[PDB]
Amino acid sequence: ASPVARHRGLAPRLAEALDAVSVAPGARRASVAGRTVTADSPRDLRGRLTNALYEELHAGRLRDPALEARLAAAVPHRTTPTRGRLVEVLRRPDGDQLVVRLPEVTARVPADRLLSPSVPPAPGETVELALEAARPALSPGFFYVMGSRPLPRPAGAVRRIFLHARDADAAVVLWGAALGALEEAAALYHAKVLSDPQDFPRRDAVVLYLHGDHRPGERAVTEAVSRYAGTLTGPDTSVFTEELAPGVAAAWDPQDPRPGQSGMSFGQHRAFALASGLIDCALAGRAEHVVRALREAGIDPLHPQNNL
Amino acid sequence: PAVNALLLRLGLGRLDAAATTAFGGRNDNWAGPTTTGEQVFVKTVTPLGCPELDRSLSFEDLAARLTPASPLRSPGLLGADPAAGVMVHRLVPGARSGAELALDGDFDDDLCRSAGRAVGTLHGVDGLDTGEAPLPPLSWLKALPWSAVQERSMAQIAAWQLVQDDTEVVDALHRLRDLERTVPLAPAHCDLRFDQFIRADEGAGELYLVDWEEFRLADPARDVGAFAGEWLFHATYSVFAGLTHEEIVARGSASLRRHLPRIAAFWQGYLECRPQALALDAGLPERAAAYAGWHMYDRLIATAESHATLNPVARAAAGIGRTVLLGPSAAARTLGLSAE
Ligand SMILES: Nc1ncnc2c1ncn2[C@@H]1O[C@H](COP(=O)(O)OP(=O)(O)OP(=O)(O)O)[C@@H](O)[C@H]1O
Ligand SMILES: [Mg+2]
Numbered sequence: 115a116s117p118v119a120r121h122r123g124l125a126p127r128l129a130e131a132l133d134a135v136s137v138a139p140g141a142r143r144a145s146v147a148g149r150t151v152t153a154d155s156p157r158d159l160r161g162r163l164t165n166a167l168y169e170e171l172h173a174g175r176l177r178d179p180a181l182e183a184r185l186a187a188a189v190p191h192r193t194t195p196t197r198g199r200l201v202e203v204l205r206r207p208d209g210d211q212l213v214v215r216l217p218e219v220t221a222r223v224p225a226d227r228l229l230s231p232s233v234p235p236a237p238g239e240t241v242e243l244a245l246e247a248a249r250p251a252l253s254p255g256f257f258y259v260m261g262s263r264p265l266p267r268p269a270g271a272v273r274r275i276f277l278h279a280r281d282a283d284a285a286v287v288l289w290g291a292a293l294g295a296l297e298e299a300a301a302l303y304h305a306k307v308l309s310d311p312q313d314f315p316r317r318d319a320v321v322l323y324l325h326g327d328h329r330p331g332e333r334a335v336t337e338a339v340s341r342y343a344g345t346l347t348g349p350d351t352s353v354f355t356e357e358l359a360p361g362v363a364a365a366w367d368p369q370d371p372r373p374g375q376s377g378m379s380f381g382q383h384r385a386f387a388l389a390s391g392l393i394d395c396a397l398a399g400r401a402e403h404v405v406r407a408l409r410e411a412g413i414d415p416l417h418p419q420n421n422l
Numbered sequence: 423p424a425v426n427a428l429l430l431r432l433g434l435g436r437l438d439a440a441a442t443t444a445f446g447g448r449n450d451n452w453a454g455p456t457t458t459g460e461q462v463f464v465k466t467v468t469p470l471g472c473p474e475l476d477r478s479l480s481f482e483d484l485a486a487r488l489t490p491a492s493p494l495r496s497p498g499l500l501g502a503d504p505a506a507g508v509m510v511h512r513l514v515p516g517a518r519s520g521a522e523l524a525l526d527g528d529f530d531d532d533l534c535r536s537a538g539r540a541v542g543t544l545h546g547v548d549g550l551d552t553g554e555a556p557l558p559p560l561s562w563l564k565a566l567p568w569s570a571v572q573e574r575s576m577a578q579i580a581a582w583q584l585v586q587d588d589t590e591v592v593d594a595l596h597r598l599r600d601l602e603r604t605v606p607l608a609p610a611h612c613d614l615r616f617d618q619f620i621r622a623d624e625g626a627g628e629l630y631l632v633d634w635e636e637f638r639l640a641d642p643a644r645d646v647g648a649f650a651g652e653w654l655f656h657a658t659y660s661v662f663a664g665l666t667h668e669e670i671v672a673r674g675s676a677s678l679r680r681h682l683p684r685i686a687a688f689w690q691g692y693l694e695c696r697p698q699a700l701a702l703d704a705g706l707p708e709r710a711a712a713y714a715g716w717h718m719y720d721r722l723i724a725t726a727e728s729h730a731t732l733n734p735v736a737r738a739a740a741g742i743g744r745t746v747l748l749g750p751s752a753a754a755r756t757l758g759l760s761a762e
Contacts, residue, residue, distance in 0.1 A: 160664070161664055201565070213564065213565045214565075218576075218579050218580065218583060219566055219571065219579050219580075219582055219583045219586065220564070220565045220566070220583070220586050221565055221566050221567075221568050221571055222565040222566065222567045222568055223568045224568070245568070246572060249572060250572075251572065251573050251574060251575055252574070252575060252576050252579075252730075253575070253576065253730055254575050254727070254728045254729060254730060
């Protein structure tokens with residue numbers, strides 16, 4: 115008559131939520147918060163379950179220019195030092211240009227954004243350019259910004275921080291606050307925030323990705339937003355994440371030891387592993403399969419916001 | 423503001439601020455009745471002298487002089503303020519987009535024949551812009567202007583990188599643009615898609631082709647290829663939006679096979695209104711097929727606007743586009759364009 119009792123080796127919040135979730139023997143039917151979900155094979159239920167879990171446990175439930183200005187104006191820095199091999203120089207009387215292979219694409223950058231060396235070097239020679247930190251279109255639905263400081267060489271592990279936000283107004287202030295805090299602590303981060311007003315509210319209305327050492331930045335963002343939790347944020351957070359305040363949660367990007375079955379978003383990754391283990395039980399107890407599934411995805415079943 | 427200015431100087435009154443809806447597209451448009459109870463469509467292309475407005479007028483000058491026996495129609499230009507970039511047209515009543523028709527199953531073989539006749543007629547010359555059209559943008563295959571990267575999603579940037587790093591594709595596109603200097607050119611839309619067509623009377627009336635901002639003297643293979651490629655794109659993506667890559671290709675291949683009659687229909691409508699298109703242009707089917715291949719990259723990159731990641735249906739579609747662009751002769755035969 116106790117959730118931890120019937121579901122051991124599992125974070126409590128999780129073991130609790132597995133009480134609202136049933137998968138029938140055969141793996142063609144399942145219940146998730148008293149919403150039923152139906153499929154014609156196991157394999158097809160794997161997908162529909164993942165989506166139902168993702169919606170109830172992780173999430174719940176235009177690009178207005180005014181907001182974007184409000185959101186854009188809330189940024190400390192204006193530029194980020196970006197490396198890449200030079201290809202070619204283009205002499206123009208209009209203004210010279212560097213053809214640079216960035217890591218995501220080959221681009222044509224005004225040569226006045228060079229920073230190192232300050233004299234355009236030979237082709238192939240690494241160069242460091244100064245590019246805008248605000249990228250409003252890069253993440254559909256989201257205004258997006260990169261830290262003023264270059265992220266680590268391999269990027270490595272990444273700490274996500276989710277900030278619920280009731281509305282645009284909420285978000286603006288949480289945005290300004292969080293970025294203000296993050297530059298002061300000199301965090302190696304990226305970040306983004308919903309730029310569509312009629313899409314709030316959302317648990318991940320603001321996301322912050324933090325590299326190398328997250329403590330300074332985390333500690334810093336925590337304190338800057340304490341004041342607002344509950345009212346400007348919303349109470350509730352993903353069951354996969356570690357809460358730090360009302361509307362403020364966090365977790366690590368997914369590390370996964372299995373090939374092919376890897377490289378998802380944090381929510382979908384967990385929900386996938388969770389749905390997998392539930393599904394694997396129904397093809398005959400239950401929490402032992404769930405727990406095994408999580409560990410094959412490199413998720414700590416006691417601390418699902420963390421990895422092995 | 424200049425819309426009512428112009429609408430008044432034209433005998434049309436002003437537009438009811440309500441009942442005046444707005445269709446999609448980058449440019450601002452207003453549709454609905456005016457105070458004199460006449461139905462208008464108003465488009466605005468803001469200037470700095472816009473080449474797009476001039477090209478749109480170069481067409482409405484030709485279309486005004488067309489007999490009713492013509493398979494090619496334009497709704498009708500009521501007037502225009504070149505200075506401020508405003509254009510007024512007769513609104514087509516209860517107009518459904520060819521893109522809605524496609525998804526609803528109603529862009530059938532008969533309507534594809536209509537479209538071909540219309541496009542065949544268009545292609546059968548002073549007043550016209552003769553500049554090369556920037557599609558595909560060749561310098562972007564070398565490098566994207568940094569300004570443009572800041573208006574693209576992560577998925578668009580990743581698609582462009584795939585293209586940029588594919589030497590065979592880039593080179594095929596160069597050869598295709600060079601042929602345009604050495605072939606019989608013809609009046610051409612240069613931006614053809616299902617959503618550049620409208621059918622009147624909720625999809626029961628006449629077929630209109632619109633948006634003539636790219637109207638030029640160009641390779642007619644652009645228009646044939648664009649329409650074939652609309653079906654290739656539809657068949658291998660729009661209809662399919664954790665399967666295996668081999669399962670996604672097989673599903674897409676079958677979908678394509680079943681949508682081929684649509685392209686053969688268009689080509690027969692085209693040859694009905696332009697039977698001697700191959701007289702001095704034997705490469706037209708091959709070139710059309712290459713443009714259809716590129717058209718798939720074009721639509722993929724456009725639909726990826728609203729994505730952070732390039733999903734595996736997108737990638738499989740892109741793979742078919744590369745088969746068509748790098749193998750245009752075989753694709754012409756399979757798409758039904760080699761027909762005589
Ligand atoms: N006369 C008309 N009557 C009814 N509908 C029309 C008329 N003219 C255009 N439309 C519809 O409105 C849409 C918008 O017009 P148009 O395509 O010219 O816009 P645009 O801003 O040039 O778009 P884009 O460049 O993005 O294609 C058309 O695609 C068509 O569906
Ligand atoms: Mg249009």
